[PDB]
Homo-oligomer: A and B are copies of this chain.
Amino acid sequence: SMFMHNQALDRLMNPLVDQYLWYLDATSGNNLTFRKAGAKNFPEYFRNWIPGPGCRNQQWNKVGTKNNPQTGTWASANKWRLQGRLNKYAPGQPNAPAEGFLTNAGDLAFANAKATGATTAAGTVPADILLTSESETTTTNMMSNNGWGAIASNNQNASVAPTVQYEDSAHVLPGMVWQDRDIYLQGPIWAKIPETDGHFHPSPL
């Protein structure tokens, strides 16, 4: 798909007319109160579709003075382990980072022909290194600077108040849509799907 979306998921609707669906807004006063979805309050609308999977990833600011001075980035990386040995998880799901931030190996990067040797360094991203951006996917996909959402952490009663907890990682669910990572001019074309008893959505990462 060569196209960037024209609308966000949460934003698919008609703003001019309210929904016919009712929800429980308020428990106050020893009674239940059902609000109606509408009146230009978007977060309360019902939706058929939810954003794509992903996981939270460490974010390094492109301005070097604002970054923690790590002699190298390994212990901070996202890792998956196989046969008792740890491998960096790269690149991850096509999650975009915050504006002005990046991740190590989370997204593709290239270099000029002027860059030789195994390393380059500059106060900001070097002039040789060519970064890529997944930001065109933020409509459907999940950003990397926070988890996927929140869920209920406890049962309630009249005495105890409701609480929630945050989910930093979200895997595949029914009714979940996402955009695959983009193909660049300097990037690979294909890959061989390994032969296994099962594989899910075999688009190369």
Q: Spell out A's residues near B (CB within 8 Å).
A: 1, 8-10, 12, 20-36, 38-39, 42-53, 55-60, 62, 64-91, 93, 102-105, 108-111, 117-126, 129, 138-140, 142-143, 145-146, 148-153, 155-165, 167-180, 191, 194-205
Contact = CB atoms under 8 A, between A and B. Distances in A.
A25 B173 contact: no
Contact of A31 (B118, B123, B159, B191): B123
Contacts of A79: 43, 149-150, 164
A72 B26 contact: yes
B87 A119 contact: no
A170 B157 CA distance: 25
A60 B32 contact: yes
